[PDB]
């Protein structure tokens with residue numbers, strides 16, 4: 001691709017073309033009060049429904 | 050964007066109803082013609098010049114508003130720096146990806 | 149009394165431009181070919197200076 | 199920062215100018231107010247009524263072109 005990451009491959013046995021994608025995606029935020037207040041947190045996931 | 054539009058609507062409504070008083074404290078109502086006479090008095094022109102030529106000034110105001118409204122549909126050079134802001138952000142992120 | 153006071157303020161500075169190929173390598177083609185991997189690192193500098 | 203804040207407002211009836219003897223009188227620095235009995239002239243930031251004389255006002259034209267013109271009297275000292 002544009003960033004020289006190997007994204008397409010041809011299978012050496014059954015010659016078909018496959019894409020490779022990373023398996024980490026989406027940003028995560030942690031909402032907390034102070035540590036001395038409580039140890040309970042909330043998690044917000046962007047990019048998920 | 051809805052909250053920013055609500056803020057601007059509140060500002061414009063407060064200008065059209067209470068004038069200049071609500072910036073300092075609470076809103077003090079005044080009819081719009083007397084407020085415009087107060088604005089004329091603050092330039093140097095006397096108060097009678099508004100009241101004796103009210104229709105012409107209102108017509109010129111409406112025509113200038115319509116001129117801006119007709120100009121914003123046609124020209125594209127206006128709002129040319131907000132586009133520069135969004136273009137620069139996009140280009141910076143794409144340069145990070147390509148490096 | 150009528151007093152006249154002077155006040156001096158800067159407005160602009162000098163416009164400069166650089167060439168990476170002459171600064172980094174000079175006139176050697178081996179360095180010039182080795183600089184192609186560092187390719188997007190000077191369009192950034194020229195963009196900022198312009 | 200030490201600042202002045204107005205408070206405790208009330209509503210009066212108002213007019214742009216007053217027509218007296220066929221000529222229109224405009225206030226100099228203030229507004230015409232009606233408080234239910236008679237018409238006074240006041241400053242806009244503090245409520246302190248003043249009677250309408252020739253010194254408070256000034257004349258411009260006849261009372262036929264202003265919208266909201268009313269009839270009242272203007273006190274001349276002689």
Ligand SMILES: *[C@@H]1O[C@H](CO)[C@@H](O)[C@H](O)[C@H]1NC(C)=O
Nearest residue numbers: 010011012013014015016017
């Ligand atoms: C062995 O490789 C060939 C490709 O040369 C392929 O056609 C064939 O299916 C492969 N054999 C098996 C058992 O997958």
Ligand SMILES: *[C@@H]1O[C@H](CO)[C@@H](O)[C@H](O)[C@H]1NC(C)=O
Nearest residue numbers: 026027044045046047048049
């Ligand atoms: C999440 O899925 C629901 C189910 O149809 C849909 O109505 C909603 O619009 C989706 N959320 C977003 C942000 O598109």
Ligand SMILES: *[C@@H]1O[C@H](CO)[C@@H](O)[C@H](O)[C@H]1NC(C)=O
Nearest residue numbers: 078207208209210211233234
């Ligand atoms: C202003 O005062 C008048 C009394 O003359 C009253 O009728 C009116 O309701 C008041 N305005 C408001 C917004 O209450």
Ligand SMILES: *[C@@H]1O[C@H](CO)[C@@H](O)[C@H](O)[C@H]1NC(C)=O
Nearest residue numbers: 232233234235236237238247
């Ligand atoms: C209006 O103001 C005058 C000024 O003293 C006062 O005499 C009069 O009583 C006021 N009217 C009412 C209805 O309070």
Ligand SMILES: *[C@@H]1O[C@H](CO)[C@@H](O)[C@H](O)[C@H]1NC(C)=O
Nearest residue numbers: 217219220261267268269270
């Ligand atoms: C004011 O006086 C003029 C002449 O005296 C009269 O024509 C006019 O109707 C009066 N205005 C009102 C509101 O009564």
